[PDB]
């Protein structure tokens, strides 16, 4: 029973103590559901935290660290109980243990603590976790351990309210520059996921990522053999090209567009949807970037997805087309018309998602407005495919911005 175990772990007899802490560890590491609340309420936490000081019994330290690791894996209240019992400074101590498995378990427990949220992360950071953590990254570290280190790095990078301090980001980026050349898939996946978390934090963090020099190593992972790697990288570069035109061009200069035919035609619709969302952010760029997308022969693939894709992919392709009309030359828009964009574009006028409808009406209006003299020909094509009837029906929509734009388009 729990009473016996709690009483026994604070013992003078080294074998009963080890046995009792081992029993507690095993209680937390077996079934799909462990008794975490009963162990928290039993009072065992101070015994386990005390066990972390026992440099004379690395087996006891490992077992106690593992128990605490698994307690910290539960809800925020359970993780905070581990934190409130003063475990964090003791785990930071065990990062300098000569015993590898003890060190790895200390890393793992700290990973679970860091993962709970931004304030917990920032506490662990303020106590100095990052340098001893990144010091493990070396050619000789065993791979199971290196993987656990990289998972902790992901948890240092992923919370955004606030993001990790700039100085912490500055320490992690050189390590990611090292790890992105690893051949192990799980390490590569985590490294790239970390980059995707840094690149979603804002334009200054995007710039730091660019300045590390890693983007030319990141872009080619879009064609990696493992799909988990491809989609992590697709997220990371997609976030970079949400930045300025200058920032977007860094990604394009890495030949990013050469990787997209295999993403636009991928069997998995989620990959199609991500890739079209990337391209919509390229076509929102300057005229030279628009031309880069045209010249990569991606517009026909986009229009096909506009016509026959899943609704999420259709919505992003609608944005990519409309954004193309906003910041595009007359001749680039003419290329769109020649590729028969108009019918599949107008077919989205009837969907129940008003945001997509607004985007489409805006793009149709801009298309007609930019072709100063050819406006009659373009109006006739819109009529031919039923677009006029669709606009007339959109005059009765609930949404004022929609019905206003439909009236304005028909009048103008």
């Amino acid at each position: 029973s729990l009473e016996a175990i709690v009483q026994n772990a604070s013992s003078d007899n080294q074998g009963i103590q080890l046995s009792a802490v081992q029993a507690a560890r095993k209680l937390l590491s077996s079934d799909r559901n462990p008794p975490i609340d009963d162990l928290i309420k039993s009072g065992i936490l101070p015994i386990l935290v005390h066990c972390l000081e026992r440099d004379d019994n690395p087996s006891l330290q490992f077992e106690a660290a593992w128990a605490l690791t698994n307690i910290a894996s539960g809800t925020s209240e359970q993780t905070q109980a581990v934190v409130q019992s003063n475990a964090v400074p003791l785990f930071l101590r065990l990062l300098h243990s000569p015993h590898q498995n003890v060190c790895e378990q200390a890393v793992w427990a700290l990973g679970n603590i860091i993962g709970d949220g931004p304030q917990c992360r920032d506490y662990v950071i303020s106590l100095g976790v990052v340098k001893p953590l990144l010091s493990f990254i070396s050619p000789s570290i065993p791979i199971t351990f290196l993987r656990n280190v990289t998972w902790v790095m992901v948890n240092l990078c992923r919370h955004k309210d606030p993001p990790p301090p700039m100085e912490t980001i500055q320490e992690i980026l050189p390590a990611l520059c090292v790890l992105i050349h690893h051949t192990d898939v799980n390490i590569l996946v985590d490294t790239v996921w970390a980059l995707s978390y840094l690149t979603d934090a804002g334009n200054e963090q995007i710039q730091m990522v660019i300045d590390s020099g890693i983007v030319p190593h990141l872009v080619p992972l879009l064609s990696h053999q493992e799909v988990k790697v491809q989609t992590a990288a697709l997220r990371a570069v997609g976030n970079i090209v949400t930045g300025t035109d200058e920032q977007t061009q860094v990604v394009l200069n890495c030949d990013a567009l050469s990787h997209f035919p295999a993403l636009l035609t991928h069997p998995k619709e989620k990959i199609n949807k991500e890739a079209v969302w990337f391209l919509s952010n390229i076509t929102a760029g300057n005229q030279q970037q628009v031309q880069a997308v045209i010249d990569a022969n991606l517009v026909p693939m986009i229009i096909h997805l506009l016509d026959k894709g899943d609704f999420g992919t259709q919505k992003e392709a609608a944005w990519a087309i409309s954004n193309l009309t906003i910041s595009g030359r007359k001749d680039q828009v003419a290329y769109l018309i020649q590729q028969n964009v108009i019918p599949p574009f107008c077919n989205l006028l009837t969907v129940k998602d008003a945001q997509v409808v607004q985007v489409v009406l805006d793009g149709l209006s801009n298309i007609l407005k930019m072709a100063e003299d050819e406006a009659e020909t373009i109006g006739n094509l819109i009529e031919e495919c039923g677009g006029l009837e669709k606009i007339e029906q959109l005059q009765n929509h609930e949404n004022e911005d929609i019905y206003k734009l439909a009236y304005e388009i028909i009048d103008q």
Partner: peptide, 21 residues
């Protein structure tokens, strides 16, 4: 003209907490 940030789930994220077995 402007860029957008994604409006979907991204349910493939790596685990925040991991319980060792």
């Amino acid at each position: 003209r402007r860029k957008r940030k994604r409006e979907w789930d991204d349910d493939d994220d790596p685990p925040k907490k991991r319980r060792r077995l």
